[PDB]
């Protein structure tokens, strides 16, 4: 159960980062990170897939209700690979990922605010920031985490967000999933060299997941070892 | 600048279509729009033209377009937000597949599971050209009137 919660994020992920690490500002604010970079990045055979990530909170006008909300330019595999359940609708095709449709995913709570009526979501349009957006899918949270006190959150194909309501080449991050059952330790340094190449400087700054995965795996199985062993010893004593 | 003036006998709209779609949008194509504040009160008219000079909001260039809506009763304040529907073509007598259940092998080939009269779902490869914001105009490989398991489809799966 707990591993399924953990492996729910698969194998693996190398989110791309600027600056130095998590706490950095200006060097992290600047991003020499073309989404085009992914091309050659996706070119490596061991990789199964790798995906762009970006997000922007913006004001959202609508009919009468008129409030800002966070939003998330992402892959269509997002709710898929996260396995996030849908309140309604689906994610989106890669074709329409290229289609730049004004399709979009929203919080159920966001609907709770927008829609006292509980009107059907699909086919409806609501502007984000400025651009009109024909809402379709909305997804229920797959975690409780009530202490998070989650606010309004929204999801877009990244091509649309970063594209036709941002236009920057530099997305917040890029997920990178390896194939082959390949080890987390290896190649991440090779990708590091890769960023030492396609960029001229030490700018990978990425975090990684079979490291923490394998170690918590050894941890849990170790707990199995202690528990089952002392149990069986006691029973043999019986 | 002592004082500004404006003629409100008719209202012009600045419909900022994205640069990706500007290549289409032939003049005189019929279009309609509606304001956020009145929810449902459609206005409509001919498109007039396209402005030669773009202006941008950081990322992504946008090109304007204009109408010429009549303004009875003194409604529509200046710079009011207005959602705008511009019309592309209406080819007819042809099926379009909802995108919710599409299968797309190769990214060219396109399998699609559909329920049969037997209660057996079965997929078929199909070719499709035209694509829509919501669906895709299928051209071959599926009959009209066919049941189509839009939700949680799998091939060969009798229900």
């Amino acid at each position: 159960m707990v591993l399924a919660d953990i492996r729910s994020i698969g194998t693996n992920t190398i989110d791309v980062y600027p600056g130095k690490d998590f706490g950095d500002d200006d060097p992290q604010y600047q991003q020499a990170l073309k989404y085009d970079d992914l091309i050659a990045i996706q070119k490596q055979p061991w990789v199964a897939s790798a995906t762009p990530a970006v997000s922007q909170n913006l004001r959202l006008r609508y009919n009468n209700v008129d409030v800002a909300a966070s939003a998330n330019g992402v892959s269509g595999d997002y709710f898929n690979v996260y396995g996030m359940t849908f309140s309604e609708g689906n994610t989106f095709n890669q074709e329409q990922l290229n289609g730049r449709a004004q399709v979009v995913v929203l919080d159920s709570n966001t609907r709770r605010q927008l829609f006292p009526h509980k009107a059907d979501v699909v086919g409806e349009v609501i502007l984000v920031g400025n651009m009109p957006a024909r809402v379709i899918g909305v997804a229920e949270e797959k975690q409780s985490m009530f202490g998070s006190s989650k606010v309004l959150r929204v999801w877009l194909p990244y091509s649309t967000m970063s594209g036709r309501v941002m236009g920057q080449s530099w997305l917040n991050s890029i997920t990178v999933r390896v194939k082959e059952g390949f080890d987390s330790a290896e190649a991440e340094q090779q990708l590091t060299r890769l960023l030492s190449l396609r960029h001229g400087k030490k700018d990978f700054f990425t975090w990684n997941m079979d490291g923490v995965l394998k170690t918590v795996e050894k941890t849990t199985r170790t707990l199995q070892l202690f528990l089952t062993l002392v149990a069986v010893i006691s029973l043999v004593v019986g | 600048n002592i004082l500004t003036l404006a003629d409100m006998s008719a209202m012009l709209v600045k419909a900022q279509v994205s640069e990706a779609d500007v290549i289409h949008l032939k003049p005189g194509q019929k279009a309609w729009f509606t304001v956020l504040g009145d929810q449902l009160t459609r206005y409509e008219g001919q498109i007039k033209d396209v402005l030669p000079t773009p202006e941008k909001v950081n990322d992504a260039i946008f090109y304007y377009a204009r109408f010429e809506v009549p303004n009875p009763n003194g409604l529509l304040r200046l710079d009011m937000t207005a959602q705008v529907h511009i019309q592309l073509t209406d080819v007819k007598n042809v099926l379009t597949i909802p995108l919710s259940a599409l299968g797309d092998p190769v990214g060219d080939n396109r399998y699609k599971v559909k329920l049969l009269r037997n209660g057996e779902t079965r997929e078929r490869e199909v070719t499709i050209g035209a694509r829509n914001d919501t669906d895709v105009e299928i051209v071959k490989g599926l009959e009209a009137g066919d049941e189509v398991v839009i939700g949680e489809a799998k091939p060969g799966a009798a229900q």
Binding site: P132 | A65, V84, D90, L95, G145, V148, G151, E152
Partner: peptide, 22 residues
Amino acid sequence: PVPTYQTLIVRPGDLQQSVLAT
């Protein structure tokens, strides 16, 4: 486990491609 499937009746439809814009 119910094999229940959401489904639709396809018909010779007419194209409604036009898009939108703020």
